[PDB]
């Protein structure tokens, strides 16, 4: 068995040395990713403000209400057409525009709010056979008072 | 260990200075690809206007009958039947022609419309027992009015 003549080829091998420093870098780079992304997680968690008001709640409807009313000029939107046909047939309609699904940036006191209305791409909620859908309101901060100022205010528009 | 041996080796072998060129050419080419759907996502934020109706909501079936009202031209089409059989066996039907799922270009105004009636190929949404299909109006301007507009046209049409 020759066990160290490879030892000794190898350490004059240009070829398996270039493979080595190669993979050493490559091990490095996903290293470096891997702590990248620990290091995002860590500056999210310890220097940003997250509220997550998924669909089943109530505030998603007065949240979303109350982003249309406050953001006029949203490009993207989606529309929610209210349609009831009483007694005697008297059909009333009325359309309620509201953000699209994907990341909306507003202005809210003096600080700037990322609005994210993501709709999960894979169930199908049996409460209401739709897809599954949430708001999250990130911002930068560690002060919670905007959020609560917020849903009250969303809240008081709804009642 | 030769520590100092690899490094100094690394620095004069041509095999292992080109793969280091080849995998910071690679991240190069990584990070730019990043950068570009960055820059798109932000074109379509700050330049594009959307429009997104759900199956669910009943402007849906208004503005595929607008744009087949509107764009009588179009070579893509799907078929909707309506069948009835009333009392006494009197068959009545009708073939009404709605625009097929893909992308359709429309000329409103004096702008360029992108419509996208997309179905979504995962889901069977249980309300209705139909995969889940929605409509998308894109278009390249930061007014939302022409959206309004078609809604209105696609409403007053409905009624």
Known sequence: MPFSDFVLALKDNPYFGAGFGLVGVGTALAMARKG??????????????????????????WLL??????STRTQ???????????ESGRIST??????????????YQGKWIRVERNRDMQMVDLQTGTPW?????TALGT????????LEEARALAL
């Open 133 to 137: 859908e949430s708001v999250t309101f």
């Open 143 to 150: 002060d919670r008072k905007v959020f609560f100022n917020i």
């Open 65 to 70: 209400s109350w982003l249309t009313r406050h």
């Open 36 to 61: 990248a992304q620990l290091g995002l997680v860590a500056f999210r968690r310890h220097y940003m403000i997250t509220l997550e008001v998924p669909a089943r709640d109530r505030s998603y409807a």
């Open 94 to 107: 009325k359309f309620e525009f509201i953000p699209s699904p994907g990341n909306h940036f507003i202005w």
């Open 76 to 86: 993207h939107l989606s529309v929610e057409t209210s349609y009831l046909q009483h």
